Amino acid sequence: PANLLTSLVRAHLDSGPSTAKLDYSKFQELVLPKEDAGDVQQFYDLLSGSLEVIRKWAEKIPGFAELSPADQDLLLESAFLELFILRLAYRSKPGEGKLIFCSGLVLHRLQCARGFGDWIDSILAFSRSLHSLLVDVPAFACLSALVLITDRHGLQEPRRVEELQNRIASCLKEHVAAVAPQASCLSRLLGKLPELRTLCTQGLQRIFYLKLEDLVPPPPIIDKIFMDTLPF
């Protein structure tokens, strides 16, 4: 934990692009001059691309594959939006308006604005605030795991999810104490989780709006996540 910390950092670093793998071939800060089908389809494709990456990342968190398969799927589905946002916010460069996606694709905020709507600006504000905390890679590797491994309604073994969460939280608390015994830093960090939930709602609102408009249908897996996480 110890070894837990190292496994978390490794899972985190293998789930995203190397700086050498960054792809700038579509990046344009100048967009010439309401959303259309190509904007909506790119929104859905960026969302979809993270899905398979996040699922592989989760399998590398020690103890996750030892949860029931029904609990794994519920935890993944429920956290998907928040993880997409958190990992995007941490990878991106909000000073420059640059969004960096898990494939390595780099886009300017103005290239995403029509598909994402105002949500992309909220994400970039959360990204600037995340960056001011100067969260180091091991701290991030625990925070993101804590977003996934958390209480959700319908869990078969809620105490086992809580034990794994406590292990990760303890691992984080120890790392933040060691790099600085002691928790104000820690409380500032954990304070990002509620804001993240609020941003996930904004994403659900954007997906609802696009489903209403109906230019291009959501891909089935995103659509199921949207429908499965609607508490009505």
Curated annotation (Swiss-Prot):
Changing residue 229 to E: Strongly weakens interaction with STK11. Residues 218-229 are annotated as: AF-2. It comes from the Eukaryota. Acetylated by p300/CBP, acetylation increases stability. Deacetylated by HDAC1. One of its GO terms (biological process) is regulation of transcription by RNA polymerase II. Keywords: Acetylation, Cytoplasm, DNA-binding, Inflammatory response, Metal-binding, Mitochondrion, Nucleus, Phosphoprotein, Receptor, Transcription, Transcription regulation, Zinc, Zinc-finger. Its main location: nucleus. Residues 1-229 form the NR LBD domain. Residues 158-180 are annotated as: Binds lipopolysaccharide. It is found in: Nucleus; Cytoplasm, Cytosol; Mitochondrion. The keyword Metal-binding applies. Fetal muscle and adult liver, brain and thyroid. One of its GO terms (molecular function) is identical protein binding. GO terms for cellular component: chromatin; cytosol; fibrillar center; mitochondrion; nuclear membrane; nuclear speck; nucleoplasm; nucleus. Induction: Induced by cytosporone B (Csn-B); directly stimulates its own expression. Induced by corticotropin-releasing hormone (CRH). Induced by growth-stimulating agents. Binds the NGFI-B response element (NBRE) as a monomer. Binds the Nur response element (NurRE), consisting of two inverse NBRE-related octanucleotide repeats separated by 6 base-pairs, as a dimer. Interacts (via N-terminus) with NLRP3 (via LRR repeat domain); the interaction is direct, requires binding of NR4A1/Nur77 to NBRE-containing dsDNA and lipopolysaccharide, and leads to non-canonical NLRP3 inflammasome activation. Interacts with GADD45GIP1. Interacts with STK11. Interacts with IFI27. Orphan nuclear receptor. Binds the NGFI-B response element (NBRE) 5'-AAAGGTCA-3'. Binds 9-cis-retinoic acid outside of its ligand-binding (NR LBD) domain. Participates in energy homeostasis by sequestrating the kinase STK11 in the nucleus, thereby attenuating cytoplasmic AMPK activation. Regulates the inflammatory response in macrophages by regulating metabolic adaptations during inflammation, including repressing the transcription of genes involved in the citric acid cycle (TCA). Inhibits NF-kappa-B signaling by binding to low-affinity NF-kappa-B binding sites, such as at the IL2 promoter. In the cytosol, upon its detection of both bacterial lipopolysaccharide (LPS) and NBRE-containing mitochondrial DNA released by GSDMD pores during pyroptosis, it promotes non-canonical NLRP3 inflammasome activation by stimulating association of NLRP3 and NEK7. The NR LBD domain binds the lipid A moiety of lipopolysaccharide (LPS) in the cytosol. Belongs to the nuclear hormone receptor family. NR4 subfamily. This is Nuclear receptor subfamily 4immunitygroup A member 1. It comes from Homo sapiens (Human).
